[PDB]
UniProtKB/Swiss-Prot annotation, chain B:
NCBIfam families: PRK04243.1 (NF003269). It comes from Oryctolagus cuniculus (Rabbit). Keywords: Cytoplasm, Isopeptide bond, Lipoprotein, Myristate, Phosphoprotein, Ribonucleoprotein, Ribosomal protein, Ubl conjugation. This is Large ribosomal subunit protein eL15. It is found in: Cytoplasm. Disulfide bonds: none annotated. Residues 164-185 are annotated as: Disordered. A lipid is attached at G1 (N-myristoyl glycine). It comes from the Eukaryota. Residues 168-181 have a biased composition (Basic residues). GO terms for molecular function: RNA binding; structural constituent of ribosome.
Curated annotation (Swiss-Prot), chain C:
One of its GO terms (cellular component) is synapse. Zn(2+) binds at C18, C21, C33, C36. Component of the large ribosomal subunit. This is Large ribosomal subunit protein eL37. A zinc finger (C4-type) spans 18-36.
Curated annotation (Swiss-Prot), chain D:
This is Large ribosomal subunit protein uL29. The modification N6-acetyllysine is found at K18, K42. The modification Phosphoserine is found at S28. Component of the large ribosomal subunit. The ribosome is a large ribonucleoprotein complex responsible for the synthesis of proteins in the cell. One of its GO terms (biological process) is translation. It comes from Oryctolagus cuniculus.
From Swiss-Prot, chain E:
It is found in: Cytoplasm. Component of the large ribosomal subunit. The ribosome is a large ribonucleoprotein complex responsible for the synthesis of proteins in the cell. Transmembrane segments: none annotated. This is Large ribosomal subunit protein eL8. It comes from the Eukaryota. Belongs to the eukaryotic ribosomal protein eL8 family. There is a cross-link at K43 (Glycyl lysine isopeptide (Lys-Gly) (interchain with G-Cter in SUMO2)). Component of the large ribosomal subunit. Interacts with CRY1. Interacts with DICER1, AGO2, TARBP2, MOV10 and EIF6; they form a large RNA-induced silencing complex (RISC).
Length: 50, 203, 86, 122, 53, 118, 53
RNA sequence: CGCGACCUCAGAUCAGACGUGGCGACCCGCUGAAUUUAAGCAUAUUAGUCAGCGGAGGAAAAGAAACUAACCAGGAUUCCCUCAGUAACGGCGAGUGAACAGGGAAGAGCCCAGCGCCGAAUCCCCGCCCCGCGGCGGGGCGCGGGAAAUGUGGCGUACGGA
RNA sequence: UCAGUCGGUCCUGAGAGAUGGGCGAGCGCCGUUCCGAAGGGACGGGCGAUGGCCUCCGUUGCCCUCAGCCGAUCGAAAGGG
């Protein structure tokens, strides 16, 4: 929909910024067990709700 | 003392003198709304013996309660169960209409606290009560030691817990062989105390 | 045409995100929330779903002010006093 | 160098304001440098400037509120923010004076019949 | 004039007092002292007024 | 005096204004949306640089709570440059991108290279 | 405080003596002890007790 | 016609306050079933239980007899043992089912209305001065305002009081 | 992903929904003009105050006088606009 409301567009904005991958320097930490970002979202598998 | 004559007169309700006053008051109160504030109590002596004092911080609310029993709020029939609980028309509420009157008066005036309530009139379909309310945050009440007990948070909403004179009657408590089913905190407390297994460590 | 073909007409949502509970249950036509009842001043809460109650309790979220009140209690809610300077 | 709050409190309001704006200008140009892409010195200095701005604002607010409550120290009605923010139940609780008020009945009762100090031989 | 309900009530109450058979114990107050005796009584009462604060 | 209309309405009474014995808040809240926090950082994209070198405008990244008038005044106070018009959009990332068209006298290239972006 | 001599009411226990609730007013007035000072000096007082013996 | 009171009811972005909602293990008030058992089932049982609604506190409620007893009498409320799976209720079927006394934990008593007696001897608010103020109080000055005689305060409450 | 001119934003349709009121043990429910003191407006006139070359006017504060409305409010990115 091209007629997005302000709140929905802001919600989509946060989801898009959350969808980025983990930086490669984090997994060099000592107490680290994050091998990858498991909560990635794809527009063809998960429809994000709404 | 005037109050002695007043209460003796009020005990003679069936006489013509009081009957004219009762019907005039009942009609006048019926013309008004269900919940309103009376600037002064209708019965001074009755208010005084219920605890009212003519000082700032005490107010009187004259409230009207629809007379009658209580039918089960279900659809037309539809008591889906055993024939014991088919009763819908001839059920009675477990609290007095006075208790209902003071609880909704207290609910409307959430800032004030119910002290007592009494009966000022009745009709075929309506009964009128006057409820005494105390402003706990008025300094004329808070600074007086003999009546500052109501200001404590323990007495929050006495009418909805059943702590007023009308509320206590519905609980069925008091000393005697006639109130064995309520010894303890209340009727439910007594039942809970009886219906437990006191399993000791050594049995 | 009861099944797969019928599913092709899903193009106008019924609920939207509630502005109080944050879940996507605010009914548009009813103008009420099926998760917390936003227009009603009292939070929707039933004892027949313990899991639903536990999912959103006092200790679930941030406790932005309550956890501050907890650490103020252990000192008795001091006010106007500061430790002596060096 | 490293700005600290010890020597900021003695500074007057206008001087603090004319230092705060310079801190804002430096933060803004450091942000511009970050966006363009520069050395790590500016990137590290961004946090320092932000904390310095925060510390200056904290000092200004503390002095302002201290002066306000000094002004309202002796008055009867004071603004809500200046009023003591304890728990709601504690605020609604009766004060020590009111709870210590005792009616003349119990006053004279304690006068006539005080609690005595006694002991009993074995 | 469509008077307010309170004005209507306080007027028809007086109408009801004039309509219903008022008992003598209540109607005795309607029979009152005359004007000249009333003002003479007030003149006498004005002598023994209580002290103000 | 007599009543002409057969209906009765509430007479208009005298109502006074607020004269509190104490202000509700001790001090007015400080303006957190000042001329420095309204604008965050100018864009350095190739598209932005192509726009500043052709249309004599500038590109800024601002918060979503800034009006076009506020942006114009903030740019004027911060950089002493007249503003012709402002066009604002909200990027899909959430930040508001503002195009600030300057007055014909000023040159966007000079303003850009003297504020840092180049 | 000190509690008085008391024997149990029922027939099953009328041969035994237990501890009482408090000293009766009649007992106190015979002993010449005021009802308000007895509690202060540590004497249990309850006004409901009678004395049929 | 108007002026001035009293009484009932309005309008206030009037000055000063309060309630709203949440947690809800425990507690108080109300409403409140069917599963199940009875080898079926309708009274009963499940059960004043689940579900539902309202209201708090650090505990709540109760509470100082319109009591228990019938003895040579005890003496607020509450909780443990015991009374007791008893008296008793029950298609007297399944089943349900207290209380008194006794031993302990704890133990604390009191206050009004009314009748009366004291010049309303009472109380609230605003102005000013002093003191400490992050539980807005104490003293003093206001022919300052108000509540109240349709009853405030002192004495005084079933154990008598004046 | 850049708008006074494209739409929303404005209006109201079927409807939905507070106040008054009534009911309800109760969360609340019914009801939308019905058991309402439902106007915060104004041509003009008078009193009093301020500013500007106190001329004349503007903002006011108070009084006189005049005044219907249909019900607060929501409801369409294809209706009006
Ligand atoms: Mg049955
Ligand atoms: Mg009865
Ligand atoms: Mg739909
Ligand atoms: Mg609830
Ligand atoms: Mg007294
Ligand atoms: Mg106000
Ligand atoms: Mg609550
Ligand atoms: Mg069976
Ligand atoms: Mg079977
Ligand atoms: Mg069967
Ligand atoms: Mg039964
Ligand atoms: Mg039963
Ligand atoms: Mg029951
Ligand atoms: Mg329950
Ligand atoms: Mg209690
Ligand atoms: Mg007694
Ligand atoms: Mg007992
Ligand atoms: Mg039973
Ligand atoms: Mg016993
Ligand atoms: Mg008296
Ligand atoms: Mg154009
Ligand atoms: Mg409705
Ligand atoms: Mg609209
Ligand atoms: Mg349109
Ligand atoms: Zn919700």
């Amino acid at each position: 929909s091209s007629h997005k409301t302000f709140r929905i567009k802001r919600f989509l904005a946060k989801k898009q910024k959350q969808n980025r991958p983990i930086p490669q320097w984090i997994w060099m930490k000592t107490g680290n067990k994050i091998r990858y970002n498991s909560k990635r979202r794809h527009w063809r598998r998960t429809k994000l709700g709404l | 003392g005037a109050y002695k004559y007043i209460q003796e007169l009020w005990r003679k309700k069936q006489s013509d003198v009081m009957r004219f006053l009762l019907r005039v008051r009942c009609w006048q109160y019926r013309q008004l709304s269900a919940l309103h504030r009376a600037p002064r109590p209708t019965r001074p002596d009755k208010a005084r013996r219920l605890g009212y004092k003519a000082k700032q911080g005490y107010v009187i609310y004259r409230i009207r309660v629809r007379r009658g029993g209580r039918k089960r709020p279900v659809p037309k029939g539809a008591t889906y169960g055993k024939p014991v609980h088919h009763g819908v028309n001839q059920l009675k509420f477990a609290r007095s209409l006075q208790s209902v009157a003071e609880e909704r008066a207290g609910r409307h005036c959430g800032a004030l606290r119910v002290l007592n309530s009494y009966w000022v009139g009745e009709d075929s379909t309506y009964k009128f009560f006057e409820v005494i309310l105390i402003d706990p945050f008025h300094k004329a009440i808070r600074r007086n030691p003999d009546t500052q007990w109501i200001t404590k948070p323990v007495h929050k909403h006495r009418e909805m817990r059943g702590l007023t004179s009308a509320g206590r009657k519905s609980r069925g408590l008091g000393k005697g062989h006639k109130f064995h089913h309520t010894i303890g905190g209340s009727r439910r407390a007594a039942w809970r105390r009886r219906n437990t297994l006191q399993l000791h460590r050594y049995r | 045409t009861k099944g797969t073909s019928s599913f092709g007409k899903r193009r106008n949502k019924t609920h939207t995100l509630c502005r109080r509970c944050g879940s996507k249950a605010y009914h548009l036509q009813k103008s009420t929330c099926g998760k917390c009842g936003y227009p009603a001043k009292r939070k929707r809460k039933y004892n027949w779903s313990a899991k639903a109650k536990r999912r959103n309790t006092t200790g679930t979220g941030r406790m932005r002010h309550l956890k501050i009140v907890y650490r103020r209690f252990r000192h008795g809610f001091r006010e106007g006093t500061t430790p002596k300077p060096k | 160098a490293k700005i600290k709050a010890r020597d900021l409190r003695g500074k007057k309001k206008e001087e603090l304001l004319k230092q705060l704006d310079d801190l804002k200008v430096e933060l803004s140009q450091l942000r511009v440098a970050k966006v363009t892409g520069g050395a790590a010195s500016k990137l590290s200095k961004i946090r320092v400037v932000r904390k310095s701005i925060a510390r200056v604002l904290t000092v200004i607010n503390q002095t302002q509120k201290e002066n306000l409550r000094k002004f309202y120290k002796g008055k009867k009605y004071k603004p809500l923010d200046l009023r003591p923010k304890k728990t709601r139940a504690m605020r609604r609780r009766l004060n020590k004076h009111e709870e210590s008020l005792k009616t003349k009945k119990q006053q004279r009762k304690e006068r006539l019949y005080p609690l005595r100090k006694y002991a009993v031989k074995a | 004039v469509k008077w307010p309900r309170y004005i209507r009530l306080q007027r028809q109450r007086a109408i009801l007092y004039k309509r219903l058979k008022v008992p003598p114990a209540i109607n005795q107050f309607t029979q009152v002292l005359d004007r000249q005796t009333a003002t003479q009584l007030l003149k006498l009462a004005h002598k023994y007024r209580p002290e103000t604060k | 005096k007599i009543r002409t209309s057969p209906t009765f309405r509430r007479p208009k009474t005298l109502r006074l204004r607020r004269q509190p014995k104490y202000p509700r808040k001790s001090a007015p809240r400080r303006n957190k949306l000042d001329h420095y926090a309204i604008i965050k950082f100018p864009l350095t994209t190739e598209s932005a640089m192509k726009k500043i070198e052709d249309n004599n405008t500038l590109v800024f990244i601002v918060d979503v709570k800034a009006n076009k008038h506020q942006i114009k005044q903030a740019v004027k106070k911060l950089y002493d440059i007249d503003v012709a018009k402002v066009n604002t959009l909200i990027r899909p990332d959430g930040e508001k991108k503002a195009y600030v068209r300057l007055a014909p006298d000023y040159d966007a290239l000079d303003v850009a290279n003297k504020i840092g972006i180049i | 405080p000190i509690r008085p001599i008391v024997r149990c009411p029922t027939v099953r226990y009328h041969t035994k003596v237990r501890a009482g609730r408090g000293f009766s007013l009649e007992e106190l007035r015979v002993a010449g002890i005021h009802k308000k000072v007895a509690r202060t000096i540590g004497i249990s007082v309850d006004p409901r007790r009678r004395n049929k013996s």
